Design a protein around this motif. Structure first.
Motif, PDB file in Angstrom:
ATOM      1  N   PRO A  97       0.836  -1.202   0.000  1.00 36.29           N
ATOM      2  CA  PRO A  97       0.000   0.000   0.000  1.00 36.29           C
ATOM      3  C   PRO A  97       0.869   1.250   0.000  1.00 36.29           C
ATOM      4  O   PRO A  97       1.818   1.357   0.770  1.00 36.29           O
ATOM      5  CB  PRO A  97      -0.825  -0.121   1.283  1.00 36.29           C
ATOM      6  CG  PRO A  97      -0.743  -1.559   1.674  1.00 36.29           C
ATOM      7  CD  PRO A  97       0.584  -2.061   1.166  1.00 36.29           C
ATOM      8  N   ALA A 153      -7.706 -20.253 -15.775  1.00 38.28           N
ATOM      9  CA  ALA A 153      -7.580 -18.861 -16.154  1.00 38.28           C
ATOM     10  C   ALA A 153      -8.596 -17.960 -15.479  1.00 38.28           C
ATOM     11  O   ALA A 153      -8.337 -16.782 -15.275  1.00 38.28           O
ATOM     12  CB  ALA A 153      -7.705 -18.725 -17.647  1.00 38.28           C
TER      13      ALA A 153
ATOM     14  N   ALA B 182      -0.477 -11.679   5.403  1.00 40.30           N
ATOM     15  CA  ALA B 182      -1.128 -10.844   4.415  1.00 40.30           C
ATOM     16  C   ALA B 182      -2.280 -11.505   3.664  1.00 40.30           C
ATOM     17  O   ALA B 182      -3.091 -10.814   3.040  1.00 40.30           O
ATOM     18  CB  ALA B 182      -0.094 -10.347   3.415  1.00 40.30           C
ATOM     19  N   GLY B 193      -3.614  -4.188   4.350  1.00 42.46           N
ATOM     20  CA  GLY B 193      -3.147  -4.401   2.996  1.00 42.46           C
ATOM     21  C   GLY B 193      -3.193  -5.884   2.737  1.00 42.46           C
ATOM     22  O   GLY B 193      -2.181  -6.511   2.406  1.00 42.46           O
ATOM     23  N   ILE B 195      -4.858  -9.391   0.868  1.00 44.66           N
ATOM     24  CA  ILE B 195      -5.370  -9.815  -0.418  1.00 44.66           C
ATOM     25  C   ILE B 195      -5.805 -11.242  -0.223  1.00 44.66           C
ATOM     26  O   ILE B 195      -5.396 -11.902   0.725  1.00 44.66           O
ATOM     27  CB  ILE B 195      -4.292  -9.784  -1.498  1.00 44.66           C
ATOM     28  CG1 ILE B 195      -3.036 -10.485  -0.980  1.00 44.66           C
ATOM     29  CG2 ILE B 195      -3.980  -8.357  -1.878  1.00 44.66           C
ATOM     30  CD1 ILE B 195      -2.257 -11.191  -2.049  1.00 44.66           C
ATOM     31  N   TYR B 196      -6.645 -11.719  -1.119  1.00 43.18           N
ATOM     32  CA  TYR B 196      -7.099 -13.087  -1.029  1.00 43.18           C
ATOM     33  C   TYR B 196      -6.041 -14.034  -1.604  1.00 43.18           C
ATOM     34  O   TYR B 196      -5.287 -13.677  -2.512  1.00 43.18           O
ATOM     35  CB  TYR B 196      -8.420 -13.222  -1.776  1.00 43.18           C
ATOM     36  CG  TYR B 196      -9.547 -12.568  -1.024  1.00 43.18           C
ATOM     37  CD1 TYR B 196     -10.225 -11.467  -1.554  1.00 43.18           C
ATOM     38  CD2 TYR B 196      -9.919 -13.027   0.246  1.00 43.18           C
ATOM     39  CE1 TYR B 196     -11.240 -10.843  -0.841  1.00 43.18           C
ATOM     40  CE2 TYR B 196     -10.932 -12.408   0.963  1.00 43.18           C
ATOM     41  CZ  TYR B 196     -11.588 -11.319   0.410  1.00 43.18           C
ATOM     42  OH  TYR B 196     -12.615 -10.732   1.102  1.00 43.18           O
ATOM     43  N   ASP B 197      -5.958 -15.233  -1.042  1.00 37.16           N
ATOM     44  CA  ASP B 197      -5.008 -16.204  -1.541  1.00 37.16           C
ATOM     45  C   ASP B 197      -5.571 -16.679  -2.870  1.00 37.16           C
ATOM     46  O   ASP B 197      -6.772 -16.917  -2.985  1.00 37.16           O
ATOM     47  CB  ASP B 197      -4.887 -17.376  -0.572  1.00 37.16           C
ATOM     48  CG  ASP B 197      -3.720 -18.283  -0.903  1.00 37.16           C
ATOM     49  OD1 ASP B 197      -3.007 -18.002  -1.887  1.00 37.16           O
ATOM     50  OD2 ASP B 197      -3.512 -19.277  -0.179  1.00 37.16           O
ATOM     51  N   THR B 198      -4.717 -16.803  -3.878  1.00 36.95           N
ATOM     52  CA  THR B 198      -5.185 -17.253  -5.179  1.00 36.95           C
ATOM     53  C   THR B 198      -4.258 -18.274  -5.820  1.00 36.95           C
ATOM     54  O   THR B 198      -4.720 -19.168  -6.515  1.00 36.95           O
ATOM     55  CB  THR B 198      -5.398 -16.057  -6.147  1.00 36.95           C
ATOM     56  OG1 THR B 198      -4.164 -15.353  -6.338  1.00 36.95           O
ATOM     57  CG2 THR B 198      -6.419 -15.099  -5.578  1.00 36.95           C
ATOM     58  N   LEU B 201      -5.162 -21.965  -5.169  1.00 39.37           N
ATOM     59  CA  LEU B 201      -6.298 -22.468  -5.917  1.00 39.37           C
ATOM     60  C   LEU B 201      -5.825 -22.809  -7.328  1.00 39.37           C
ATOM     61  O   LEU B 201      -6.200 -23.833  -7.905  1.00 39.37           O
ATOM     62  CB  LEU B 201      -7.382 -21.394  -5.983  1.00 39.37           C
ATOM     63  CG  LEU B 201      -8.813 -21.726  -6.399  1.00 39.37           C
ATOM     64  CD1 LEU B 201      -9.289 -20.681  -7.383  1.00 39.37           C
ATOM     65  CD2 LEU B 201      -8.923 -23.121  -6.980  1.00 39.37           C
ATOM     66  N   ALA B 202      -4.992 -21.937  -7.882  1.00 39.40           N
ATOM     67  CA  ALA B 202      -4.482 -22.131  -9.233  1.00 39.40           C
ATOM     68  C   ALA B 202      -3.699 -23.427  -9.368  1.00 39.40           C
ATOM     69  O   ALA B 202      -3.955 -24.217 -10.270  1.00 39.40           O
ATOM     70  CB  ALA B 202      -3.608 -20.928  -9.649  1.00 39.40           C
ATOM     71  N   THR B 299       2.037 -19.223 -11.672  1.00 42.75           N
ATOM     72  CA  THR B 299       1.363 -20.014 -12.687  1.00 42.75           C
ATOM     73  C   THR B 299       2.387 -20.385 -13.755  1.00 42.75           C
ATOM     74  O   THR B 299       2.537 -21.565 -14.070  1.00 42.75           O
ATOM     75  CB  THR B 299       0.194 -19.227 -13.350  1.00 42.75           C
ATOM     76  OG1 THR B 299      -0.738 -18.818 -12.345  1.00 42.75           O
ATOM     77  CG2 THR B 299      -0.548 -20.099 -14.358  1.00 42.75           C
ATOM     78  N   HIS B 366       1.258  -8.008 -13.067  1.00 37.53           N
ATOM     79  CA  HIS B 366       0.348  -7.438 -12.083  1.00 37.53           C
ATOM     80  C   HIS B 366      -1.119  -7.718 -12.433  1.00 37.53           C
ATOM     81  O   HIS B 366      -2.027  -7.112 -11.850  1.00 37.53           O
ATOM     82  CB  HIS B 366       0.574  -5.930 -11.966  1.00 37.53           C
ATOM     83  CG  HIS B 366       0.219  -5.168 -13.205  1.00 37.53           C
ATOM     84  ND1 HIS B 366       0.782  -5.442 -14.433  1.00 37.53           N
ATOM     85  CD2 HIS B 366      -0.640  -4.141 -13.406  1.00 37.53           C
ATOM     86  CE1 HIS B 366       0.284  -4.616 -15.337  1.00 37.53           C
ATOM     87  NE2 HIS B 366      -0.581  -3.816 -14.742  1.00 37.53           N
ATOM     88  N   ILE B 367      -1.344  -8.617 -13.395  1.00 33.46           N
ATOM     89  CA  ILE B 367      -2.702  -8.989 -13.787  1.00 33.46           C
ATOM     90  C   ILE B 367      -2.771 -10.392 -14.380  1.00 33.46           C
ATOM     91  O   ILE B 367      -1.879 -10.823 -15.103  1.00 33.46           O
ATOM     92  CB  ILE B 367      -3.315  -7.983 -14.780  1.00 33.46           C
ATOM     93  CG1 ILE B 367      -2.253  -7.486 -15.761  1.00 33.46           C
ATOM     94  CG2 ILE B 367      -3.929  -6.813 -14.018  1.00 33.46           C
ATOM     95  CD1 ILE B 367      -2.842  -7.126 -17.104  1.00 33.46           C
ATOM     96  N   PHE B 368      -3.852 -11.096 -14.064  1.00 33.76           N
ATOM     97  CA  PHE B 368      -4.060 -12.473 -14.497  1.00 33.76           C
ATOM     98  C   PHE B 368      -4.882 -12.596 -15.778  1.00 33.76           C
ATOM     99  O   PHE B 368      -4.898 -13.649 -16.419  1.00 33.76           O
ATOM    100  CB  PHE B 368      -4.751 -13.256 -13.364  1.00 33.76           C
ATOM    101  CG  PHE B 368      -4.352 -14.698 -13.283  1.00 33.76           C
ATOM    102  CD1 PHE B 368      -3.070 -15.057 -12.892  1.00 33.76           C
ATOM    103  CD2 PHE B 368      -5.252 -15.699 -13.629  1.00 33.76           C
ATOM    104  CE1 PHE B 368      -2.685 -16.396 -12.848  1.00 33.76           C
ATOM    105  CE2 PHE B 368      -4.876 -17.047 -13.591  1.00 33.76           C
ATOM    106  CZ  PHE B 368      -3.588 -17.389 -13.200  1.00 33.76           C
ATOM    107  N   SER B 369      -5.557 -11.518 -16.157  1.00 33.56           N
ATOM    108  CA  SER B 369      -6.396 -11.541 -17.344  1.00 33.56           C
ATOM    109  C   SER B 369      -5.748 -12.119 -18.615  1.00 33.56           C
ATOM    110  O   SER B 369      -6.442 -12.732 -19.424  1.00 33.56           O
ATOM    111  CB  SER B 369      -6.949 -10.138 -17.612  1.00 33.56           C
ATOM    112  OG  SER B 369      -5.949  -9.245 -18.064  1.00 33.56           O
ATOM    113  N   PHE B 371      -3.993 -14.766 -19.259  1.00 33.04           N
ATOM    114  CA  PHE B 371      -4.264 -16.194 -19.432  1.00 33.04           C
ATOM    115  C   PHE B 371      -5.659 -16.506 -19.948  1.00 33.04           C
ATOM    116  O   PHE B 371      -5.887 -17.562 -20.548  1.00 33.04           O
ATOM    117  CB  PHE B 371      -4.065 -16.938 -18.115  1.00 33.04           C
ATOM    118  CG  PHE B 371      -2.648 -17.024 -17.695  1.00 33.04           C
ATOM    119  CD1 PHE B 371      -2.165 -16.205 -16.684  1.00 33.04           C
ATOM    120  CD2 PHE B 371      -1.778 -17.902 -18.341  1.00 33.04           C
ATOM    121  CE1 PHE B 371      -0.837 -16.256 -16.320  1.00 33.04           C
ATOM    122  CE2 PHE B 371      -0.454 -17.963 -17.989  1.00 33.04           C
ATOM    123  CZ  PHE B 371       0.024 -17.135 -16.971  1.00 33.04           C
ATOM    124  N   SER B 372      -6.594 -15.595 -19.708  1.00 33.73           N
ATOM    125  CA  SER B 372      -7.961 -15.808 -20.143  1.00 33.73           C
ATOM    126  C   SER B 372      -8.204 -15.325 -21.561  1.00 33.73           C
ATOM    127  O   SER B 372      -8.936 -15.949 -22.305  1.00 33.73           O
ATOM    128  CB  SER B 372      -8.929 -15.108 -19.191  1.00 33.73           C
ATOM    129  OG  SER B 372     -10.266 -15.341 -19.586  1.00 33.73           O
TER     130      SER B 372
END
Lengths: 403, 403
Positions: A97, A153, B182, B193, B195-198, B201-202, B299, B366-369, B371-372
Motif C-alpha cells: 500500500p 484462467a 497478508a 493491505g 489480499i485473497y489467496d489465489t 487455488l491455481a 502459474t 500485475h494482472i491475471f487476465s 491467461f484468459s
C-alpha cells in the motif's frame, strides 16, 4: 448425401441448453459452466500500491534537492501508518500500500544511499509507479459472464475477489449402452462370430473427460423387452442417450422398429469418411445418438457430431471443438470426391520451423492405430480428389481426448 | 542468470520415476501410465482376409483369360469351408476369410460379369488385396510399451484384445500450501493491505487436471513452528511438496531458514519473464517446489517447470509439454534482451486461413487476465529485443489447463 454442417446444424438448432444449477466451491468448478455473470464485489487492486521496490516520495521533497532519510516502510501485508515528516521518504515494496499523500514511487536503481538521507538520481514524474485502486477491475463490474467455462484462467481471478463458490450449470447426464449377442465383455470367451465390445469403453472414457455424468448400462442382450427397458430407464435419467453400437443406424431389424416407436428418430447418411450412418432424434425426455458399429467410425462420429451437441447442452456459450489451420502436406493423400474425409495425420516442424502434415499411414477403418500415431485430422473437402505433396490442406489438431 | 533449459535439466536429472503400481479396469485408466508392456494375447487379424469386396482367385484360372463363374461366396462372418472348383473364382467381401489356396483378390470394380462367368482386367498381381494374419498385431507382440500414457487412442485397442485391466504406476502425490499473514481465505474480511489467496487455488486446479492426488494444507500461519509442522506433514504424505506462496525463494527470513534446515534446497534466478526466483530441492521423503508469490509468475513457473517434473515422476516416457510452431505476429511486441519472455497472445486464422499471433494486451505480471484472453505463449528468445509486425515468432499454444 447430407453434409456434416447440415447435420450439425439440424441437431444444435433443436437443442435447448440446460438451466438447472448448483453452487460449488471454486476448487470443484474446473470445466463447469457459470450459471450467472460473476460481478466483482470489490476494486482490484483494492488500494493504491507500488509497482516496484523502492521508495514512496512527494514531489516537493524531491525538489528540495537534498537527500531524504527513511521515516518508515511499507511491506506486503504491513502498510506504513506513521508520521512521514517533510523531507523524509518511505521505503516501499512491490504490491505494498502506498502511504497517505504519496505522489510517486521511484525504483531502487535510481537511488544512492547516504548518511543524511537518500538521493534520487533520475527525474520523478507525478504518479509514476503507483498502481491505482480499481484500475484493473472495479466493484460492480461483470468479470465473467454466464456461459463461461471455468478454468485455471478464470477461477483464480474469481478467488481474488473473495468469492468462495459460484453457481454453475449442473453436469450433462448421458446414458450409454451397446446391444447384441455377438458382443462380449473383454475377459470373456470369444464365441464363434463374436467380438469384444470396445466402442462403449471409447465413449465412456471421452464422456468422463468431457465432464459428463455417465450412466453406463453395459451390453443389452438381443431381446425386445430388455432393449425397450434400457431406453425407458436411460431416457428417464439422462439428457442424452447414446448407443455405442448394435442398435440400428438405418438398417432394418428389430432394433430399428423399437427405436421408431420410442421417439422421433432420423436415420441419416452423412457425406463423411470414415463413417456415414448416424441416428439422431428426440425421445420422451432426452436426445438420442446412435453410432455405427465400426470402432473408427463411431469414434469419429462421436467426436465431430456428439461432442458439439454435448457442449451446447452444457450451457457453454463458446464453440466446443478445435479450430483448424492451413498447412502443406509432405505426404500424398488418397481422397475420393463425394465425401468429407477426416483422415488422420501427423503435424510436425519442418526444417524452416513451419508445420507440415504427414499421413499416419493407411486410413482404412479396419485398424484403430491412426488415432495413436497421429496428432490431428486432415479435414479434406468433400469435392476434393487426391492431394499431392506440396498442396495446402486443412488440419484439425487432436484435443485432449487423444493425448 | 540461470537458463530455463539448464534449470529444467538440473531438475529432471535428479528425479527418479515412481514405480509403485496397481491394476485397474480399462475405464479408470485415462491419463494413467502403463507400469509394464501390454503384450498381445492373439493375432490381428486372426487369419488372412480380403481387403476388398471383389473376387478371390487362383493365378491359374486367371491366365485362362476366359470366364470364371462364381463358385461361391465368403463373408466377413462365416468363411468358405466348402470347395473351390478349379477354373472358377470366389466372391469375397472385405474382412472375409480368403479361401484355402487363394493367391489374390480383385476389386469387383475392375471386373465385368458376363451372363456365364466373371472376366477380369488389370493383371491380378499375386498377393494383392489380402490382409494376412498378425499383419497389424502379431501374437506375443508389444502393442504399447511401459511408460505410455493411456488415452482414448490406446485403451480401446487394449480392450479389443480381450484384456479387461492393466497395471499402471500409482498416482503422483502432491502436497500444497501457502503462507503469509497478508493472505485471507476467500470468504472473510480483508485486513489492512490484505489480499485473497489465489496461487494455491491455481496450482490445486492444475494438479488435479494433471491427474495428481492433492493434499491441500491451506494457509499456514506466519510462525516458524506452524511452518515447520506444515513441511513435516507435507513431506510425509507427498512425492512433491509445493509452496504456492510465502515461503522464501531467495529472500532471507524465517521461512528461508526453515527451508535450509529441513532439506537441501537450492535457490535459482532463471532468465525468464514473468517470474525469475524459484526454490527447488530435496526434503526427507519428497521433492520441494517453491514458487514466486506473484500470480502470473507462479502459474508460469509451475507450468514450465513443475509440470515437466510431475510428468517424469509419473513414469511417463514422453516429453510432457506442448510443442511450438513458428508464426507471424500481427502485433508489435515489447521485449527486453537478457530474459526468455513467455508473453501471452491470441493465435487465430488470418484472411488466408493461416495462423498469426496478436498480443493479449499489457504483459505485466500485475494482472491475471492475460491467461484468459490468450490461447498461447509467444516465446521470445532470450537475446531478442523489440518485435515488429510481420516478424516470425515462436508460439506455444496453451494445453487443456487454460481452457
Amino acid at each position: 448425401l447430407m453434409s456434416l454442417d447440415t447435420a450439425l446444424n439440424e441437431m444444435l438448432s433443436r437443442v435447448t441448453p440446460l438451466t438447472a444449477q448448483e453452487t460449488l466451491p471454486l476448487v470443484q468448478c474446473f470445466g463447469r459452466i457459470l450459471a450467472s455473470d460473476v460481478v466483482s464485489p470489490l476494486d482490484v487492486p483494492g488500494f493504491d500500491n507500488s509497482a516496484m521496490d523502492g521508495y514512496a516520495v512527494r514531489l516537493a521533497d524531491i525538489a528540495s534537492g537534498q537527500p531524504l532519510p527513511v521515516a518508515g516502510k511499507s511491506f506486503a501485508g504491513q502498510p506504513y501508518h506513521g508520521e512521514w515528516p517533510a523531507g523524509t521518504c518511505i521505503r516501499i515494496m512491490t504490491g505494498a500500500p502506498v502511504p497517505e499523500g504519496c505522489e510517486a514511487v521511484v525504483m531502487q536503481e535510481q537511488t544512492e544511499q547516504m548518511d543524511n538521507g537518500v538521493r534520487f538520481t533520475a527525474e520523478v514524474r507525478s504518479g509514476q509507479n503507483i498502481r491505482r485502486r480499481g484500475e484493473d477491475i472495479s466493484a460492480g463490474a461483470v468479470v465473467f459472464p454466464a456461459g463461461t467455462r471455468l478454468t485455471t484462467a478464470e477461477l483464480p481471478v474469481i478467488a481474488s475477489l473473495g468469492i468462495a463458490e459460484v453457481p454453475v450449470i449442473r453436469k450433462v447426464r448421458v446414458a450409454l449402452f451397446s446391444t447384441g449377442d455377438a458382443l462380449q465383455l473383454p475377459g470373456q470367451p470369444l464365441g464363434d462370430g463374436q467380438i469384444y465390445d470396445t466402442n462403449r469403453l471409447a465413449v465412456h472414457l471421452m464422456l468422463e473427460q468431457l465432464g459428463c455424468e455417465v450412466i453406463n448400462l453395459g451390453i443389452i442382450r438381443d431381446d425386445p423387452h430388455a432393449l425397450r427397458a434400457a431406453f425407458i430407464e436411460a431416457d428417464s435419467q439422462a439428457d442424452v442417450v447414446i448407443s455405442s453400437g448394435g442398435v440400428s443406424v438405418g438398417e432394418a431389424d428389430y432394433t430399428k422398429t423399437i427405436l421408431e416407436e420410442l421417439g422421433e428418430i432420423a436415420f441419416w447418411k452423412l457425406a463423411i469418411k470414415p463413417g456415414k450412418p448416424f441416428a439422431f432424434g428426440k425421445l420422451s425426455n432426452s436426445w438420442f445418438c446412435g453410432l455405427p458399429g465400426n470402432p473408427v467410425s463411431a469414434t469419429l462420429t462421436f467426436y465431430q457430431l456428439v461432442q458439439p451437441l454435448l457442449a451446447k447442452l452444457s450451457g457453454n456459450t463458446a464453440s466446443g471443438l478445435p479450430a483448424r489451420q492451413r498447412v502443406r502436406t509432405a505426404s500424398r493423400l488418397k481422397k475420393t470426391p463425394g465425401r468429407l474425409d477426416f483422415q488422420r495425420g501427423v503435424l510436425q516442424r519442418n526444417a524452416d520451423g513451419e508445420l507440415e502434415v504427414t499421413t499416419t499411414g493407411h486410413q482404412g477403418s479396419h485398424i484403430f492405430s491412426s488415432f495413436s500415431l497421429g496428432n490431428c485430422f486432415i479435414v479434406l473437402e468433400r469435392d476434393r480428389g487426391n492431394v499431392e505433396v506440396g498442396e495446402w490442406v486443412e488440419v484439425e489438431p487432436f484435443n485432449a481426448l487423444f493425448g
